[PDB]
Amino acid sequence: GVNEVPDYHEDIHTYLREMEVKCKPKVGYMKKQPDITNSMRAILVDWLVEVGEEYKLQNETLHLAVNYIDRFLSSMSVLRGKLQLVGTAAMLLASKFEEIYPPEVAEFVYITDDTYTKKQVLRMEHLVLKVLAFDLAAPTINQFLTQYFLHQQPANCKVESLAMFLGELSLIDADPYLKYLPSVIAAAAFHLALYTVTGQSWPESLVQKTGYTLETLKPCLLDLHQTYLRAPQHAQQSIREKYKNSKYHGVSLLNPPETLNV
Amino acid sequence: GPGSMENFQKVEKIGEGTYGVVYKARNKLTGEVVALKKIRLDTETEGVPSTAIREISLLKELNHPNIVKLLDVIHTENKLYLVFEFLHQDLKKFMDASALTGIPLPLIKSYLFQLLQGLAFCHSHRVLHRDLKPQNLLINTEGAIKLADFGLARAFGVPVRTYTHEVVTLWYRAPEILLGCKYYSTAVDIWSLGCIFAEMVTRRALFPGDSEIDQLFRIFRTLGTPDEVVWPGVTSMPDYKPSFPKWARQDFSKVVPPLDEDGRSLLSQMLHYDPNKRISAKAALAHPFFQDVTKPVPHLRL
Numbered sequence: 154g155v156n157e158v159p160d161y162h163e164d165i166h167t168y169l170r171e172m173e174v175k176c177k178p179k180v181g182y183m184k185k186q187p188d189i190t191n192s193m194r195a196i197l198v199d200w201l202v203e204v205g206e207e208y209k210l211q212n213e214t215l216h217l218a219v220n221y222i223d224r225f226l227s228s229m230s231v232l233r234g235k236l237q238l239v240g241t242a243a244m245l246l247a248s249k250f251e252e253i254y255p256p257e258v259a260e261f262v263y264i265t266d267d268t269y270t271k272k273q274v275l276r277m278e279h280l281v282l283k284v285l286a287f288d289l290a291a292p293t294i295n296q297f298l299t300q301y302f303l304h305q306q307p308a309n310c311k312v313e314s315l316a317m318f319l320g321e322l323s324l325i326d327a328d329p330y331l332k333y334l335p336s337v338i339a340a341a342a343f344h345l346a347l348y349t350v351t352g353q354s355w356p357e358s359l360v361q362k363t364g365y366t367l368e369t370l371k372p373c374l375l376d377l378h379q380t381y382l383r384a385p386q387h388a389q390q391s392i393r394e395k396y397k398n399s400k401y402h403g404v405s406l407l408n409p410p411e412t413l414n415v
Numbered sequence: 416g417p418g419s420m421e422n423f424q425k426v427e428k429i430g431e432g433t434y435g436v437v438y439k440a441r442n443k444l445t446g447e448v449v450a451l452k453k454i455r456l457d458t459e460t461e462g463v464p465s466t467a468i469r470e471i472s473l474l475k476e477l478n479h480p481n482i483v484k485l486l487d488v489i490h491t492e493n494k495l496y497l498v499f500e501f502l503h504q505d506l507k508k509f510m511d512a513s514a515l516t517g518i519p520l521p522l523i524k525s526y527l528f529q530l531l532q533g534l535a536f537c538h539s540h541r542v543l544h545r546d547l548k549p550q551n552l553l554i555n556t557e558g559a560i561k562l563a564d565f566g567l568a569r570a571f572g573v574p575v576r577t578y579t580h581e582v583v584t585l586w587y588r589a590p591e592i593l594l595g596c597k598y599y600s601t602a603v604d605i606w607s608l609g610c611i612f613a614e615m616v617t618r619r620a621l622f623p624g625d626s627e628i629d630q631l632f633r634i635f636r637t638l639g640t641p642d643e644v645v646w647p648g649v650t651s652m653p654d655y656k657p658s659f660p661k662w663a664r665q666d667f668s669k670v671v672p673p674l675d676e677d678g679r680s681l682l683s684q685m686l687h688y689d690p691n692k693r694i695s696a697k698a699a700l701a702h703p704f705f706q707d708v709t710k711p712v713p714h715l716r717l
């Protein structure tokens with residue numbers, strides 16, 4: 154279990170919980186965004202999901218990039234014609250951090266349809282770094298999920314993939330999800346996934362680890378449950394498409410439960 | 416980023432790397448001596464190097480007495496200057512400077528102890544160093560040793576996923592990396608420290624291989640060719656070969672003859688084949704080897 158760092162897993166968990174509060178965006182930044190909306194953000198993030206599929210990037214990278222964009226947009230006012238340049242630089246930085254083999258800069262210019270130049274992407278890379286003050290090692294929903302996953306009795310791939318899927322759906326909708334921390338969405342997503350697949354619920358053991366109960370998870374859970382039901386109808390569909398793939402056990406094809414008995 | 420290249424006075428070059436060159440500089444207002452590592456974003460052909468992105472982001476949160484402190488980042492459009500705290504020397508030059516004197520056991524003990532504290536701290540903050548070697552451990556005049564060069568470091572998740580392969584300078588590379596295992600963890604850092612421990616004692620590298628396979632073979636000839644008994648899975652590993660020579664494990668007192676019972680105990684546990692049995696930095700802090708550890712200054716000068 155060295156791959157699961159037994160000697161350090163709690164230290165790490167405790168550390169991530171602290172860091173997720175420091176790396177948190179402003180829940181209400183889009184109102185102070187004169188020229189962009191939750192809807193435009195959803196489009197951008199949906200696009201980034203496609204880019205990740207296109208370049209076969211990690212899911213962690215996608216989560217990182219979204220974290221970078223929401224923190225940048227928490228302090229930097231951006232015109233709609235520039236939203237994609239922020240997003241592309243976010244994805245580039247996230248790739249350089251998280252990927253063994255980042256796509257080359259040229260490849261990032263390419264996926265923007267020569268909207269932007271290689272200079273613009275690089276100049277924005279610097280700006281994002283200055284704005285974030287290099288603080289790129291941010292806890293993501295995934296880094297929580299993978300730890301929660303160790304608490305399954307026994308592990309179940311359908312549960313894992315579906316948790317991932319739900320958690321990814323949350324990236325799309327700044328409202329409501331900006332108001333919840335990565336550790337809480339992951340916990341919502343885990344229970345939802347577990348319930349859906351096996352009927353089971355948030356385990357005692359994760360209550361011990363996290364301090365969270367179905368009581369404290371309820372708000373987020375109610376939101377996530379809706380997002381799950383209304384996902385076939387959402388204007389953005391790239392995550393559902395992605396989670397059809399056998400790589401993720403075709404979980405997007407599973408039927409959400411009608412009630413949570415919660 | 417409360418810093419400006421105009422308050423520094425270059426003194427001399429103290430090192431170099433892919434990133435670029437390191438200089439010792441003096442802060443003209445506070446008097447503080449720093450190391451300036453210059454990254455030539457000038458070669459912006461791909462922008463800011465990922466190595467520098469990792470080094471900076473990870474060092475910004477790794478605040479520990481036995482990890483070299485990043486003080487500041489000065490961020491021109493042309494260049495990027497990392498301001499690090501200044502340490503006089505690195506452990507490899509000291510080991511050379513200690514040629515036929517030896518390093519006194521109190522100092523080895525102290526240094527290993529500090530290295531373990533710093534690595535434990537890295538591990539407790541989801542960071543793998545992945546290039547622990549003597550050249551990358553900095554010492555001061557006050558008896559401190561600190562982990563440095565985080566250029567190859569990497570923020571891991573739990574459990575770990577597959578990361579870059581053939582990491583770590585070869586002489587210090589753990590067998591599970593040499594055998595192409597899908598996954599590697601904190602244990603690889605421990606392995607490196609184990610090599611360094613042995614090296615601080617003998618002043619010679621323990622496994623100085625000239626190739627991956629020569630490396631494995633040097634390891635196997637010393638600790639024994641691993642089997643399913645000592646190390647379950649080994650024979651299934653992608654770069655395990657059944658044709659590997661089967662060398663008997665030599666008695667450990669022979670691997671490092673001057674080392675005492677406690678020292679050998681600790682060394683063996685740092686060099687356990689199976690990453691799952693290999694000791695953690697955290698558990699190793701409690702080993703009896705350290706019962707009487709102090710922090711003496713280095714016996715020689717810069």
Ligand SMILES: COc1cc(Br)ccc1O
Binds near residue numbers: 194196235237
């Ligand atoms: C105009 O620029 C846009 C950018 C994104 Br992202 C979505 C919608 C837009 O209209």
Ligand SMILES: COc1cc(Br)ccc1O
Binds near residue numbers: 197200236237238240
């Ligand atoms: C204007 O079109 C787009 C804008 C953004 Br941002 C992302 C994807 C698009 O297709």
Ligand SMILES: COc1cc(Br)ccc1O
Binds near residue numbers: 283286486488
């Ligand atoms: C913002 O100032 C900073 C300070 C350090 Br230390 C590292 C990166 C920075 O950007």
Ligand SMILES: COc1cc(Br)ccc1O
Binds near residue numbers: 420422438451
């Ligand atoms: C004299 O101050 C400086 C020192 C170094 Br090193 C680089 C640029 C400077 O301006």
Ligand SMILES: COc1cc(Br)ccc1O
Binds near residue numbers: 431483503504505563
């Ligand atoms: C002695 O050489 C060095 C010292 C420091 Br501090 C940082 C980097 C170096 O290369």
Ligand SMILES: COc1cc(Br)ccc1O
Binds near residue numbers: 628656658
């Ligand atoms: C993987 O390469 C090798 C394997 C053996 Br067994 C001997 C020599 C080699 O060069």
